[model samples]
Target: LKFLVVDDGGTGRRIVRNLLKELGFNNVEEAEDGVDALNKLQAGGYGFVISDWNMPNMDGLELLKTIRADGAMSALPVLMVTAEAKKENIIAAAQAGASGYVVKPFTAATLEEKLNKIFEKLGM
Candidate 1:
């Protein structure tokens, strides 16, 4: 899948990028924030999105909301990756149409599980 990994921090972006690489998805791309992510999404061909919650110039929730609102990519799978472990945060993402949620500092196994769960649900 063509994956977009969005995070303001380089460390977070690299971590997720490498994780996706290890999972055999080498076509992953990085976006510094939601604005950057949207710009890339506008270019089209992105099949999946992994985004960080806290970011400048538009947070992940807003990104997810925008993506969900867009008719072309409305059904796109967005797996949120963030440090926000609060129940409300998770609930909010789910309500906003997140395909899955993963807390920050997650292991590769956890990410794989979440990705697989979404894939199974979508019959990907």
Candidate 2:
């Protein structure tokens, strides 16, 4: 499966990319923010999106809302990786149909666990 990382911070994007490589995924693409991600989305062919919840121009929630609202792209899986670990944020994400949520500063172990859970739930 292919993965897209959408985050504004260079450090965060790089960290996620390195971790994904460590996790043995070769097909990953990075996007700076929601707008960039959206543009990349338009280009097509990504199965998974691992995004930052907070970003300039377009935030994660709004980006996700757009994705779910679009009939053509609604089935895509979105995994929100964020510092916005608040209850309200979590509630909003669930309501918006996030496939998974992982908090910021997470371990590779945590990432693995979440990925497994999502895959199991998705029957992959």
Candidate 3:
């Protein structure tokens, strides 16, 4: 399975990439924000996405919304790893079809756990 990391920070993608690399997934891509993410998704073939929720331009929620609404990519797994720490935000993400959610300042263990849950749920 392929992965895409969507975040405003340059290091964000690299962090996720390394984690995925350790997990035996070396092919990963990066997107600056949700708009960039959406464009990449439209091009197709990404199996999973690890995204940051807060962005000035096209937030993760909007990206999640669009992806859910798109027939072709509707089932794609989106794991939101973000600084938005609101309980309601996670609830909204759950309601909006996120495959998993992780708060920012998250540890490698936490990310691995979340990824495990998503992969298990997706039957990947």
Candidate 4:
């Protein structure tokens, strides 16, 4: 699946990309923030989005909201990975239509589990 990994920090993006690569998801792209992510999304063909919650220009929550609001990508799966581990943040992400959520400093196993869960739910 084609994946978009969005994060303002290079380390964050690289970490997720490496994790994804380990999972055998090599068809991946990077976006610096929500605005960049949206621009990439507009080009189409993305199967999944792994985004950071806090970012400049636009955050992951807002990105998820925009994706949910857009007709074309309304059903797109967006997995938010961030340092925001608060209950309220998780609730907001769910309400905004996030496909899954993962807190920062996560292990490869955790990411794999979340990805599997989303894939199972979507029958992918």
Task: For each candidate, give its TM-score against the true structure.
Answer: 0.97, 0.94, 0.93, 0.97
Q: What overall lDDT, based on C-alpha atoms, would model 1 receive against the true structure?
A: 0.93
TM-score attained by model 3: 0.93
Score candidate 4 by lDDT: 0.92
What is the lDDT of every predicted structure here?
0.93, 0.88, 0.87, 0.92
Candidate 4 lDDT score at position 96? 87
Root-mean-square deviation of Cα positions for candidate 3 versus the true structure, in angstroms: 1.2
lDDT of 2 by residue, 15-121 (tens): 88998899899899999888999999888899888889889999999999999998877988888886744778877898999998988789889988888888888
lDDT of 3 at 37: 91
lDDT tens per residue, model 4, 1-124: 8999999999998899998888888899999999999999999999999999989999999999999999999988999985745778888898889999998889999999999999999989
Q: Model 1: per-residue lDDT, tens digit, 55-98?
A: 99999999999999999889899999767457788889999999
The residue pairs that clash in candidate 1, if any, are none
**Any runs in candidate 1 off by more than 4 Å, and if so which?**
none
Q: lDDT tens string, model 3, 60-97?
A: 89999999999999999999875655888898898999
Candidate scoring better on TM-score of 1 and 3: 1
